[PDB]
Design a protein around this ligand. Structure first.
Ligand SMILES: Cc1ncc(C[n+]2csc(CCOP(=O)(O)NP(=O)(O)O)c2C)c(N)n1
Ligand SMILES: Cc1ncc(C[n+]2csc(CCOP(=O)(O)NP(=O)(O)O)c2C)c(N)n1
Ligand SMILES: [Cl-]
Ligand SMILES: [Cl-]
Ligand SMILES: [Mg+2]
Ligand SMILES: [Mg+2]
Ligand SMILES: [Mg+2]
Ligand SMILES: [Mg+2]
Ligand SMILES: [Mg+2]
Ligand SMILES: [Mg+2]
Lengths: 295, 297
């Protein structure tokens, strides 16, 4: 079998575009903003303005509220969903009194993240026709059932491009972090036209799709404040799925890989860097998570 | 198999009697080693420190330790400070260097500060009792990695020594670092089963459940779960993050107990589970699997 190679490249390279997946993770610097329960440390307003719909997952509402501790009243989430065991009474009242669509789901088998995603998927299927499509659903798992029902009735338009920016889904309770990644892989397998970006305090996390991927951006300066001790943005390729091992070929990373097999309990490329000034290429034998540091 | 994958909703409180099995006592802290990575320290550092024999700072982790005192900072000097040193600040570096910390610089581009620190820890328990300056004059690029390797090829390794390593700031920061840490957790257990690793974060404690039966015990849940009222049970999760999938689970004592429940990424993963066992619980797994338990002391 081919030699697993790692090529140390110069700090800067120009990679020409490659039949392939084109990812533009930094365009933000059908858009949906999903807010989970963690203190918001990014330029919320800037992202918000680029999104068509904003959804708060239970406690995410508190996070949005507290962000204003700008007029808090100018940023009302379209939907607030979950079992509501974290959202605070005052916050809940506040947004309810401002028109946020409340979807309480008491199911102990789906978390607020999943319930919110279902709400988002159902929104792009039923909202344009019925603004209050959510009001009469089952209180336990109506979102789960309804999304399942629509597919059973063939009433689902599988042809709609959605980009979901998720805040506060990574970095908190570890099981929540892993569940989010799990759903990232699952959603791509089930709904390939939905692109998910987890934007955290330290980086942006997305999925590289089986095959050739071309990640582009104007330049690295848009997401990596000019260094001097850091001529390159940090990144990683994380094989967190049940498909192992994954073969990687990269062009444009500081430590470029050629037929390099990656898997947990094996070698994992972390602390890699981006040398491509305008983009880089990653070919993978199966879906794999990639994180790029932002600062 | 063909067995039904069951999930049993248990009452908020249960008493599970002890089960050969792996006994895990994650909260005894509420051969101990403290490994400090680069992130603001939010835990009760001094209490943990006082329970540890050796303390190691992975590069930037020294800054984290330093800033914690912004108690006398001078009373807590780390035994070792290792890594490529591209994050530790000159000031902090000089500060601890002037206080006796053993400095081990490693410029290798193929191992991170975490791994270099672990190697230093493993090497310490092998060579330090012999010579306090065993680390000096080692290769500047990957001497630790080489030494650990050469030491094994020389059969000079004391394979029988129980070590418990408490790691701070390895989870929750840059995601690739989080993943690499978990990767190492699995690798270390495969290669060094006598070393027990506990990742203590701002939100939880993360450790490995070992293939077979595991009995997790503690005085009571009040030890790590500040009395509830609207939260009668501590939160936990079982995360199949290895290359061995799927993993079959059987639990006794969790709010949502599993029986012959198959878990894997791209499939079902038990998250937001809770702990019903008042003094402990049991998890049997077909292969090693990560478990996190939320902490709020
Ligand atoms: C095998 C298994 N493991 C765990 C669970 C628990 N569970 C899965 S998602 C669901 C709700 C999670 O609620 P949230 O999204 O508010 N997260 P939380 O704040 O309750 O920890 C629960 C309790 C379950 N139902 N089944
Ligand atoms: C296939 C592959 N991927 C990535 C790398 C890069 N790499 C692995 S660990 C090593 C050093 C990591 O340094 P640190 O522990 O200080 N973490 P950092 O602050 O540099 O991001 C590097 C640069 C590599 N050498 N090979
Ligand atoms: Cl550039
Ligand atoms: Cl208790
Ligand atoms: Mg909730
Ligand atoms: Mg809940
Ligand atoms: Mg929920
Ligand atoms: Mg370093
Ligand atoms: Mg470094
Ligand atoms: Mg290093």
């Amino acid at each position: 079998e081919l030699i697993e190679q790692v090529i140390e490249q110069p700090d800067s390279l120009i990679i020409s575009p490659p039949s392939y997946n084109h990812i533009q993770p930094f365009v933000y610097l059908h858009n949906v903003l999903l807010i989970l329960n963690q203190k918001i440390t990014i330029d919320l307003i800037s992202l918000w303005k680029k999104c068509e719909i904003i959804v708060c997952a239970d406690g995410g509402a508190n996070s949005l509220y507290e962000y204003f501790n700008l007029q808090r009243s100018d940023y009302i989430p379209d939907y607030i969903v979950g079992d509501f065991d974290s959202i605070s009474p005052d916050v809940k009242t506040y947004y309810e009194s401002h028109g946020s669509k409340i979807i309480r789901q008491s199911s102990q088998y789906y978390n607020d993240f999943t319930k919110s995603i279902h709400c988002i998927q159902l929104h792009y299927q039923l909202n344009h026709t019925k603004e209050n499509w959510f009001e009469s659903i089952d209180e336990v798992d109506g979102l789960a059932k309804l999304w399942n029902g629509l597919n059973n009735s063939s009433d689902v338009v599988v042809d709609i491009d959605i980009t979901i920016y998720v805040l506060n889904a990574i970095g908190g309770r570890f099981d929540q972090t892993v569940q989010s990644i799990n759903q990232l892989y699952i959603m791509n397998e089930d709904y390939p036209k939905v692109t998910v970006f987890f934007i955290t305090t330290n980086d942006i996390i997305f999925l590289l799709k089986k095959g050739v991927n071309y990640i582009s951006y104007k330049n690295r300066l848009m997401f990596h404040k000019d260094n001097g001790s850091s001529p390159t943005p940090t990144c990683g390729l994380l094989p967190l799925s049940n498909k192992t091992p994954i073969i990687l070929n990269s062009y444009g990373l500081k430590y470029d890989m050629r037929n390099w097999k990656t898997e947990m309990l094996g070698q994992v490329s972390s602390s890699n860097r981006i040398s491509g000034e305008t983009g880089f290429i990653v070919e993978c034998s199966d879906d794999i998570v990639m994180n790029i540091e932002i600062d």
